Design a protein around this ligand. Structure first.
Ligand SMILES: *Cc1c(COP(=O)(O)O)cnc(C)c1O
Ligand SMILES: *Cc1c(COP(=O)(O)O)cnc(C)c1O
Lengths: 315, 329
């Protein structure tokens, strides 16, 4: 069943690297409560961020970006996001028992307008999920300026050029959220990290479980970082394949988003939508369904061309 | 801003000989480590793996060894800690009884749950409590740090209250009994288990809850969907496929613990009838410190508490050292 529904990296984790992990782990470590953010892991996360302002104290980690989101809504009066966004901001907020406010994105995906100010946390996944489009930093400042806390979920950073992390130089009410689930093929290992003001990390760490990231998991994070180029070349393909089938879709007469993620969003009505879903299913093909369209993830060349073929015998 | 009074985050400074966190003395079988990576599926690390793995659950049932427990009575968590953590988000009020698992209180504050602490009797018994439905009452049996064992009727009393009981059996492996069977009659109960202790897997955070089908159904909705890594489950899994190797280490832990006790008593020491992978030794402050002061002098770490000290069972040579060090006091 050709799977393209969760923005999962088409590439398995390099076998070479799995070995290095295995060959670099100390059996004697598995018995003890290993430090959550490894001193080493943070050092690698920094050299990967490549900055000159953030330090050790500006970083922490979570059991997958999620746990980060999950624990942040726990430390703010109200969570504010803007559908259509990450499907889990709503679910988690409700589960954690946080007060949230959902303000629909404009007719043009732009960030709406609402109260928002200190005491608030506003989740802005840029590249957004699931349109994949990118909020212009002019926009994130608007909200930063409100004094409210901005949680930039740069979960798709690797697929898109820049990341507004540098905003940390002049805004302390911001925290960048990243993950290894995407570009690094570690979605099953649950490793995510956060970048924010020292005052933040110091608080964040106090509310999160002490040991939220397995020994073995940071190792993968760490080995993964020591071979970033291997991944940056899969990514290079992911994107090059993505900004292909987009051109391939527009030709077929589809209306898509200018996504900069490891996926493409295809706009289309509920009726005909439910139709090609029943058609894709008879073709063992799966994609992410939503309101206002479908989000198809980027897979292997053959999978990718599959979509373009089965999506033309339709429209 | 939003500044908090809660205790700061730190990382235990581990001495040359650490006996402060109830960690299994022995490393994870090197052989099993291999078995783990041998099953490890390269192209699996790239997908969102089911947290409660189908076979892990099954392995867990096999471990609990019953007839009434089914796949709908079992779930997992990012360590028994994560279970405690998310559980508190579920109930209006969390209830525990010092001396107890110190993280209850701590977690209580991180999450913002409402809680009430009711000291145990001088004989370590659950006191009277205005508890009832809407409340979750955490009772780690065998107890931490005393390690003493609560009685059946002691737990069922609270159970009949209608109040939801969290029976934290993090230390079951070091004690014969477990009151999981209570799930036959009562639903307002959940047993918390863990691979951190007797399975030398604390570094891989892998815990599980056995509770009534209606409860799990709820828990899965609250907890993070993917809270246990594919590799972490793998570890827990093979671990179960080789429980023998472990149970034999546990046999050692206990045989070593019961020894240590008998010896500590002769010393004149007043200890607890600890049924966990440790021993609790009551001491009177202005001499309890003189013990620690010394131990710190000799690069030794034990867990200091209100009324005394909790010492973890380590390797034989270590257990041999504590006895000696305590004699001279
Ligand atoms: C995929 C995704 C996540 C999940 O990341 P993990 O590292 O698997 O927790 C979080 N946020 C957004 C916006 C995502 O798209
Ligand atoms: C040690 C301990 C825990 C921690 O379990 P993990 O699986 O390591 O999270 C939970 N509860 C009690 C009562 C403990 O003593």
């Amino acid at each position: 069943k050709t799977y393209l529904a969760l923005n999962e990296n088409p590439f398995p984790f390099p076998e070479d690297l799995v070995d290095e992990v295995f060959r670099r782990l100390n059996s004697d470590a598995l018995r003890i409560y290993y430090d959550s953010p490894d001193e080493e892991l943070i050092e690698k996360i920094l050299s990967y961020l490549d900055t000159d302002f953030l330090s050790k104290n500006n970083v922490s980690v979570g059991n997958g970006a999620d746990e980060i989101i999950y624990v942040m809504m726990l430390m703010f009066d109200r969570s504010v996001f803007f559908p259509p966004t990450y499907s889990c901001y709503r679910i988690f907020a409700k589960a954690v028992g946080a007060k949230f406010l959902e303000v629909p994105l404009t007719k043009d995906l732009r960030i709406p307008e609402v109260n928002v100010g200190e005491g608030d946390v506003v989740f802005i996944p840029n590249p957004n999920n699931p349109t994949g489009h990118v909020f212009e930093r002019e926009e994130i400042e608007r909200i930063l300026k409100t004094g409210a806390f901005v949680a930039l979920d740069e979960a798709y950073y690797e697929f898109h050029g820049e990341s507004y992390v540098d905003f940390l130089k002049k805004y302390e009410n911001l925290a960048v959220i990243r993950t290894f689930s995407k570009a690094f093929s570690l979605a099953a290992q649950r490793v995510g990290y956060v970048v924010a003001s020292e005052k933040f990390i110091d608080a964040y760490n106090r509310v999160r479980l002490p040991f939220n990231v397995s020994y073995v998991s940071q190792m993968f994070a760490k080995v993964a970082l020591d071979h970033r180029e291997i991944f940056e070349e899969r990514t290079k393909f992911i994107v090059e394949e993505r900004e292909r089938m987009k051109s391939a879709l527009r030709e077929m007469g589809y209306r898509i988003t200018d996504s900069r993620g490891n996926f493409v969003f295809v706009f289309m009505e509920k009726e005909e939508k439910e139709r090609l879903l029943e058609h894709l299913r008879t073709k063992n093909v799966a994609v992410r369904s939503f309101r206002e369209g479908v989000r198809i993830t980027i897979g292997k060349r053959e999978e990718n061309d599959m979509i373009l073929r089965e999506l033309e015998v339709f429209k």
